[PDB]
């Protein structure tokens, strides 16, 4: 028998549904709030570490954090606001202190993590509103190795961002530099990545909520990967088997095998017999979903 201890750290703002991001390996968690808009960064157990307000340089207007993403390896967060700006939240690394291995307890590690996150920095990427054309940053997504970033605005623009990890006197800082300016049909709902080898390549998929699932690679061209007769609801991707699943709003699912040029071939087509439909990977090769029903 088990019980869930509950921590409910209140915030002055209003929580967002899909704006909660969790690091895969490091025990970190961040989520957005609006009116007053900010971001709350907390550890896995629920204790609040830090809160970050409006991006620097704001002229008295509080900006809503519209997208959040965690770096897959670094303890680094990227936040796309609603006024076109883009910010990077980075705390000094604990291992940079080169102290002893006496951190055998969770409380001491939490304390040193908190004191490291207290002196964290929110850096602004230059000209982000220029690349997003003064549009709210709808979505963002890091690469598998965390070297490339993809950002999608509400003005139907997709921008590629390069991450530069430069060393300094006391810590390691990060700079995000824009590279491309790609036009999309609609603002992109979800950005997914495809790895070259199952376990540094450019292979991303953009779903804008319409009838387009546009692939993108190093060719700097938004060539579609798979387009179906209906508006897409969501895409679910398996990186190891390179298996794509496209689900539509009319309870239709299709299974594609992604090739090297990001092209899918249908092999499993199925139909399912207000809450939007959700679909996640239950197991490798096994997909679980529910349509807001009891089953």
């Amino acid at each position: 028998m088990s019980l869930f201890v509950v921590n409910a750290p209140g915030h002055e703002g209003q929580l967002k549904e899909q704006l909660i991001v969790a690091h895969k390996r490091r025990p970190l968690l961040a989520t957005a709030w609006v009116n007053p808009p900010s971001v709350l960064i907390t550890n896995s157990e629920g204790e609040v570490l830090t809160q970050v307000a409006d991006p620097p340089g704001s002229t008295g207007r509080t900006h809503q954090p519209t997208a959040l993403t965690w770096h897959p390896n670094e303890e680094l967060l990227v936040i796309g606001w609603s006024n076109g700006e883009m910010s990077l939240w980075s705390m000094p690394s604990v291992s940079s202190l080169a102290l002893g291995e006496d951190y055998t307890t969770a409380a001491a590690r939490s304390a040193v993590q908190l004191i490291a996150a207290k002196a964290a920095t929110q850096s602004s990427a230059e000209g982000a509103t220029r690349e997003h054309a003064s549009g709210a940053v709808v979505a963002s997504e890091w690469s598998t190795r965390g070297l490339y970033l993809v950002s999608a605005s509400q003005q139907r623009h997709v921008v590629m961002w390069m991450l530069e990890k430069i060393p300094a006197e006391t810590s390691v800082t990060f700079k995000l530099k824009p590279l491309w300016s790609v036009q999309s049909r609609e603002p992109v709902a979800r950005i997914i990545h495809v790895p070259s080898k199952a376990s540094d390549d450019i292979s991303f998929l953009l779903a804008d909520g319409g009838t387009s699932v546009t692939a993108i690679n190093e060719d700097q061209q938004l060539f579609p990967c798979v387009t179906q007769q209906e508006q897409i609801a969501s895409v679910l991707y398996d990186a190891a088997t390179r298996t794509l699943v496209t689900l539509t709003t009319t309870s239709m699912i299709e299974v594609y095998a992604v090739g090297e040029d990001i092209k899918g071939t249908s092999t499993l087509r199925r139909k399912l017999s207000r809450i939007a439909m959700s679909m996640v990977w239950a197991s490798p090769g096994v997909v679980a979903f529910g349509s807001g029903d009891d089953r």
């Binding site: 390069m162 530099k177 824009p178 590279l179 491309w180």
Partner: peptide
Amino acid sequence: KRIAMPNGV
């Protein structure tokens, strides 16, 4: 291969 310059310089 292809490498893009920052800012498209």
